[PDB]
């Protein structure tokens, strides 16, 4: 049903790239890399805007905050790290993590910080102050996934060792945790954008949508290759309602929503397409490879 064309090929990270996101305003495309490095570029041109270095090794995970001016990272140094844009300064460096930071996001109002680690806790931070808030003894393996809901209220988790968990903000506690007929490992997870429903990937090559309040699977989507990596997928909401995702088979995949059907197969990357982000007005997805392709790319659909 769409007809996503490749129109840019964006080249310049040196090491696989591990994470793209567009700013809430639709100008720009950030990713993070292997490198070490984030790198901000046009969302409607693909051209090259700049560098943002500091950390000291890899970073996994990249996310903008409500406005477009600040973006949070998240490294293998143990640390987060959050960037005026504009700048180029580094503001604050999150220091409390014991093991690489896997997934960061900042809530709505972008007050708060959430992150993800090796280390297996999930942590909440101030992001004027820079202090931790909170720590959540949230699961047993590595924390794959961190959002907030669309009002603040909800954080999902995900992890290696099975478990989706859906915790309140506020008080810290554990509201859910989504079990399964299987609990393979969860390498990606996310609110839908009205709150309702989860979307999490699992490593058997699966994708679920559940119903948060319920607590049951409602669709299951398949076809792509995830057994290995972690790999976003995204709700595409500005024209036909998809599932987008990347794939260890160098695809990305876009289903139907509600019929599960794989609408269409994404064609050019020569390595595991690790990320994938869908822009918030316009029918454009970005995508980016591991360390054999390196480039990020960025394709249209007129639907």
């Given at each position: 049903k769409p007809n996503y064309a490749l129109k840019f090929t964006?080249?310049?990270?040196?090491?696989?790239?591990?994470?793209?996101?567009?700013?809430?305003?639709?100008?720009?495309?950030?990713?993070?890399?292997?490198?070490?490095?984030?790198?901000?570029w046009g969302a409607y041109d693909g051209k090259f805007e700049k560098t943002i270095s500091g950390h000291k090794l890899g970073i996994s995970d990249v996310a903008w905050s409500s406005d477009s001016n600040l973006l949070v990272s998240?490294?293998?140094?143990?640390?987060?790290?959050?960037?005026?844009?504009?700048?180029?300064?580094?503001?604050?460096?999150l220091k409390g993590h014991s093991n690489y930071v896997f997934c960061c996001n900042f809530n709505p109002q972008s007050n708060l910080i959430v992150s993800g680690s090796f280390?297996?806790?999930?942590?909440?931070?101030d992001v004027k102050t820079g202090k931790c808030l909170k720590t959540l003894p949230a699961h047993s393996d590595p924390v794959s996934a961190?959002?907030?809901?669309?009002?603040?209220?909800?954080?999902?988790?995900?992890?290696?060792?099975?478990?989706?968990?859906?915790?309140?903000?506020?008080?810290?506690?554990?509201?859910?945790?989504?079990?399964?007929?299987?609990?393979?490992?969860?390498?990606?997870?996310?609110?839908?954008?009205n709150g309702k429903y989860i979307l999490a990937a699992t490593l058997d090559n699966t994708l679920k949508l559940w119903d948060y309040s319920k607590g049951k699977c409602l669709?299951?989507?398949?076809?792509?290759?995830?057994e290995k990596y972690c790999i976003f997928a995204n709700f595409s909401v500005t024209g036909g309602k998809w599932i987008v995702?990347?794939?260890?088979?160098?695809?990305?995949?876009?289903?139907?929503?509600?019929?599960?059907?794989?609408?269409?197969?994404?064609?050019?990357?020569?390595?595991?397409?690790?990320?994938?982000?869908?822009?918030?007005?316009?029918?454009?997805?970005?995508?980016?490879?591991?360390?054999?392709?390196?480039?990020?790319?960025?394709?249209?659909?007129?639907?």
């Open positions: 964006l080249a310049g990270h040196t090491k696989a790239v591990s994470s793209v996101k567009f700013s809430p305003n639709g100008e720009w495309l950030a990713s993070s890399s292997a490198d070490k490095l984030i790198k901000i998240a490294s293998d140094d143990k640390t987060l790290k959050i960037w005026d844009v504009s700048s180029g300064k580094c503001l604050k460096t280390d297996e806790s999930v942590r909440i931070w961190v959002h907030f809901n669309r009002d603040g209220s909800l954080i999902v988790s995900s992890s290696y060792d099975g478990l989706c968990r859906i915790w309140d903000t506020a008080s810290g506690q554990c509201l859910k945790t989504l079990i399964d007929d299987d609990n393979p490992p969860v390498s990606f997870v996310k609110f839908s954008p669709k299951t989507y398949t076809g792509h290759k995830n995702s990347g794939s260890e088979d160098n695809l990305v995949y876009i289903w139907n929503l509600q019929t599960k059907e794989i609408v269409q197969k994404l064609q050019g990357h020569t390595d595991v397409v690790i990320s994938t982000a869908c822009h918030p007005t316009e029918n454009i997805i970005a995508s980016a490879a591991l360390e054999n392709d390196k480039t990020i790319k960025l394709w249209k659909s007129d639907c």
